[PDB]
DNA sequence: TCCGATGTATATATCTGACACGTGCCTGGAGACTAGGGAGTAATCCCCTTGGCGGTTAAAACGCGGGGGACAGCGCGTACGTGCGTTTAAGCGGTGCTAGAGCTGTCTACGACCAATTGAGCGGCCTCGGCACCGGGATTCTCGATA
DNA sequence: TATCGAGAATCCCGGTGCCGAGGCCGCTCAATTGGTCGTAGACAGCTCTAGCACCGCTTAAACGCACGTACGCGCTGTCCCCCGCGTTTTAACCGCCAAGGGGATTACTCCCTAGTCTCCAGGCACGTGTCAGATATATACATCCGA
């Protein structure tokens, strides 16, 4: 039933590509776990608020608008998904 | 045989990924991470496909911008290599880290 | 003629102080900060409840919008304890008719 | 009845 | 004859003013309509959050051997609690000062 | 008898919809009342700010040898302009990417 | 049955595009971003105009609250040029009314 | 009456006391000019908005409420002066 | 004669100023700086006394918090001395 | 009509 | 460790001014009641989300070799902290003026509201031009080797 | 300290294909016209707060300078850990079929809130007395740093 351990599917080469878009030339091997921990904290904060909007609407489906409102409330406004 | 020097292909990769706009995380792995995180807030949640894409676009923008600030913290410490302490400084000065 | 009414939370902040610490007093500077804190948290909660009503196509801010705004705005155990107190108050008020 | 504080 | 008036604050079991909160919700342009339970719930939350800060600030006053809460005690209360510090992270308290905190590398070697 | 309708948008000299902006101001819980000049001024500002982004993004499209504005061109338009970058500093543009930017110390010696 | 009418700024964004770059087109994702931008700037300006009316004990949002909200919200020369266009529009409208 | 060059009245020992409250043990002599430039930019941003609130009210006096609103809209809410 | 070693009185001063809550800038010099900055936005503004005090409390809180982030940037670079490049890093990472 | 853009 | 010089914490006694309290009255909260439309509910359509299947091939994982960057240890000189005597001007209290914040009281122009009318804007249709890609050739950055 | 030139790389071109942008059309709902009524707020007039200006005194604080030491930072040497890249394995991605949960309506009804009118007591401004605590003066006790 439940999912587990999917943060390890955020691969070393994916984290390297994100760091390359961030202009990073050289990466310590300890960065990949630090980045996974940071990403899980960021997603937990956005998804908790998005699911709070979904529950207030009495819906079972998290919409792109629930995500856009959760991001706006946290001061990270996203254009291109509505709102 | 032919071989590029350390950091030459890194600079080529920086130029490639700063020219491009596509999402850099694999979509199915990221979607499973979103569903795993969501199950702790309530069970049996569905997602609009565009909700997962909104979460991925926001997450990659956040990580890329944090890598820029991390890279400045490395360069300030006279290094070209980013380390966990550079992420920790960037997040503390941003007011994300206590 | 005497000066116009300036409305304040100070007497209710003082009633709450006398409950948590009956022998403790408060300075007027600290009372001014408490009044600013109450006004700020009111405006945050009412503003998020306002957004929640608008997003859902609703004309009314209810106890349910306030509860979701409190869950969004307050961190961690402050939310759980604030939601407990808000629900207890509306339950007591409803029973009193 | 008293307040349900996090401390009490 | 009409029955003797009693406050909605007293019907709720609250110190904070339910009627004033209701009038602030109606006049503050938050929505077209305000539900009867909305000001009771909001008054209870403002009262609870007041009680959380004041309990910690009266503890800070007592630890500093003072019987009066001053802006310093509100700052010590807020910054020594991780959740009130998260709630008030963008807030400055006038005459609050800062937490006593020296970075470990700066302390003299012994 | 009754005269033919003229849009408040064309009466103001605007492309942006003054009647829709007025109805959004009245229904948005911004104040009790909305003045007749308020939606005209606001529609003009939204139109002007649209024209500023679209000018820079149409130039970004042309510099990229494209005829169609894509999210990339809006991102280049915004981040290469210091004032639109300040206005949109907390905003993510979906599918926009980043500015080409390498720290000088990372480039090889000459 | 046909779907219910979802309004957007897309036709007016396209009218402004046809004025500033007559031969340039726009993708639907870029149009969606432009619609989000217009909604976001409307909500910021109307929200600051709303605070300005309340702070001054006023019931009405007027052209004057919109002008001050624009001066607070827009950086540098964006404010000066937006205020020029807002004042030009209101003076043409009140001449033609 | 008129005023000029008052940023020099933000003295080296005042900037040192602020740095000491910030936990700073040792200060380079270049810091005092950098701190003055930073303070002038901070005050220009708050006072421009405060004066914008003052002019909107048609007042000639900047109130503590004009300052508190200017600080609040810049994400720097101040308690203890009203609001 | 008696001397304390370099940084001993600095640590004593950190302890003193982190204990206290008083404004650390001189009030009359700060008030003249506020009036000078204001005259570029409008001529002959008055200030409430409490408006100047609100500006000073916000300004000192802002500078103190920036010195904390600057001190972390110095320590990250293996220094105990703050420098302009530490203020520049702190303000860049904050997004100021 | 003309726009008073920062570019003109 | 251990002494002198210095600094902080702790005690007691003064006195002062801010807090907590009590009093009167008035304005805004509550009691009682009505009209009407928001939203709770039931019923229904059909969107779009979830799930599963097979092929393919892009991408991840792995292992290896080696070079260049992290970081420790060292030297050295300069720029900062400490402490002193001198100079500056802040802070205090005090007097005094008057700009202008704040409030009262009268009007009237403006906006909310309603009812009728009609064209601006939406969803649905559909078609052909811009862009994505193939796949090859021209050209240019890298870097071991030549001189 | 610049020059070959084999190699991998990016840019660039002409051709192929498709599928998304943007015009066209018909319906409808929301914007406009025209008109009424009520009160927000513009204006005039007045009170008296509190902000600005200046004086003179005291002394806290800023300034300027001398000294010396501990820190910044350039150098050099080691070695490890990261990059580049060739090979193998994984599973993402795509195109497709299929079911049905649940989002998104639509109609119907009633109970909830806005609005009105009339009290009447909770909360405010004001005026008051006294004890919490800011301070001077004293000195017990802890720390620092040369010996």
Numbering used by the authors:
A (entry chain F), H (entry chain B): 20 to 102
B (entry chain E): 38 to 135
C (entry chain H), G (entry chain D): 26 to 122
D (entry chain K), J (entry chain L): 577 to 584
E (entry chain G), F (entry chain C): 10 to 119
I (entry chain A): 38 to 133
Publication passage describing the model:
In the cell nucleus, chromatin is anchored to the nuclear lamina, a network of lamin filaments and binding proteins that underly the inner nuclear membrane. In mammals, four main lamin isoforms are expressed: the A-type lamins (A and C; A/C) and the B-type lamins (B1 and B2; B1/B2). Using cryo-electron microscopy, we identified a specific binding motif of the lamin A tail domain that interacts with nucleosomes, distinguishing it from the other lamin isoforms.
To further explore this interaction, we analyzed the binding of a synthetic peptide comprising amino acids 572–588 of lamin A (LA 572–588) to nucleosomes. Using cryo-EM structural analysis, we resolved the complex at 2.3-Å resolution. Eight amino acids (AEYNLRSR) of the peptide were resolved at the nucleosome surface, while five amino acids (YNLRS) were found to interact with the acidic patch of the H2A–H2B heterodimer. The side chain of Y579 forms a hydrogen bond (H-bond) with H2A E56, stabilized by a hydrophobic interaction through H2A A60 and H2B V41. The main chain of N580 forms an H-bond with H2B H106 and E110. The Cβγ of H2A E61 and E64, the aromatic ring of H2A Y57 and the side chains of H2A A60 and H2B V41 provide a hydrophobic surface for holding the side chain of L581. Most importantly, R582 acts as an arginine anchor to H2A E61, D90 and E92 through salt bridges. Lastly, the side chain of S583 interacts with H2A E64 through an H-bond. Remarkably, the YNLRS motif is unique to the lamin A tail domain and highly conserved in evolution. Our structural analysis revealed that the motif YNLRS in lamin A specifically recognizes the acidic patch formed by the H2A–H2B heterodimer within nucleosomes (top left).
